[PDB]
């Protein structure tokens, strides 16, 4: 097969096996070309307390880490010409920040399944001479409006969903949960970070994927088969291409609808969890008690990359009335509108097996405790002179977070009071040991003080109002709580 010239000719099928043999050839370690470790800042935390309007809460830091280990790249943008089925593209720090660097170099033909029910065998198979995004794009919308055409309008299809879920702590934990490039939209979603360690606040971030179909290639026989005849080694080696940079194709697309939600609460109630599921799941079983209040106090933000025309909604539908309406949007797929790309796979080329990668990050989980103000209101309509002692601790955290305990008394403390006199103590969440004693005067030479009221560590509860009232001898007292 050698040329006598001792060339390889450009177009000849010599040129392709030199290509293939080159391809075959690469030794490469999968593991650490895929793999990223972000920051293992595993240090100490301080505890800490904030107060704030109508409560004090206190912050607890524990240590965790996120690790993530998957095949399936989420798409975040909405007309990208370098990814689709079939593409080749560049193992690089590019590919995973998600931000690939495509291989445009002459492509064989290529075919293509789509897995469209109610599609039959023979049927699903799409022939591209030459794979580029448009080209394949417009194989596959030929084919949907011709299925549109005897399926999608007379059967509900529906769609398949795919939901998922976490906790927002950071950035770089949400990059892990959902992509390396989720910055762009998380971003969009307008993520108080800042209000979540500092108490205030507590947001999930959830994924709805809602695929309508998915296009995919067989494995490759071979590495050549990919190229054109026309593309040589030395064409891959000025692009780079070599065993420490080698190629994967993307072995298949989901195409579909896809939302991210934002659900942020002001409500420290450490049980939203349930609160914030019920309004996924919209069960809504006596939307009017503890999961009303809550998701009362819920500002919703999304982004939606939607089966229409390629763009992202970023509406804040203010309203979590509002969720079930997008849940809703997507739900069945009629072929009026090819959804975009929501997800890809990767293969290496040199042996078809799929790509994987790996992510870690080490974050900071904030538990939050709120321990809400609450008011002691006093009431004295006695016909007799009463002294009040009312005590307790303050508590802060001090840099080092260890708990201070400063002391307090109410200023009227020790000063008589007769009737009708009332008054009302404002006492925040961070009040301790609360103490409260109430004697009164009985005017009796061998009891001159009698002791009405007297408890320790009173409970700090929303309302309490102690009356007391009667005679010198037959003194009444009423402890009346309110929650
Ligand atoms: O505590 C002072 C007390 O003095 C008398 O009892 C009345 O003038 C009351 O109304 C007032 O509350
Ligand atoms: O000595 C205690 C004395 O304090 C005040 O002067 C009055 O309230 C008296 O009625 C009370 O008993």
Known sequence: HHHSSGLVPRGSHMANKAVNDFILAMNYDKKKLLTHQGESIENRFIKEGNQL????????????????????ISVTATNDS???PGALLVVDETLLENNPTLLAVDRAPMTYSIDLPGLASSDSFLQVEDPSNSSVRGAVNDLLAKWHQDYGQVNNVPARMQYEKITAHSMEQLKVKFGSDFEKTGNSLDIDFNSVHSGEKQIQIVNFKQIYYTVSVDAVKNP?????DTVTVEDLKQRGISAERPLVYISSVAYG????????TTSKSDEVEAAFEALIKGVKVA??????????????????????????ARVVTGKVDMVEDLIQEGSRFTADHPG??????????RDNVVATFQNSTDYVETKVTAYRNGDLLLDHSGAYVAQYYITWNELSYDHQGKEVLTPKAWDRNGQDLTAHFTTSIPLKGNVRNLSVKIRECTGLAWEWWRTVYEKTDLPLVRKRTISIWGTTLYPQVEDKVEN
């Open 53 to 72: 309007p109508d409560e004090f809460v206190v912050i607890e830091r524990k240590k965790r880490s996120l690790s993530t280990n998957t095949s399936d």
């Open 82 to 84: 370098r990814l689709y």
């Open 224 to 228: 050549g088969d990919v190229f054109q």
């Open 257 to 264: 609808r896809q939302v991210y939600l934002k659900l942020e």
């Open 287 to 312: 939307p009017q008690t503890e999961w009303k209040q809550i998701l009362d106090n819920t500002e919703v933000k999304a982004v939606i990359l939607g089966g229409d025309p390629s763009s992202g």
């Open 340 to 349: 975009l790309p929501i997800s890809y796979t990767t293969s290496f080329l």
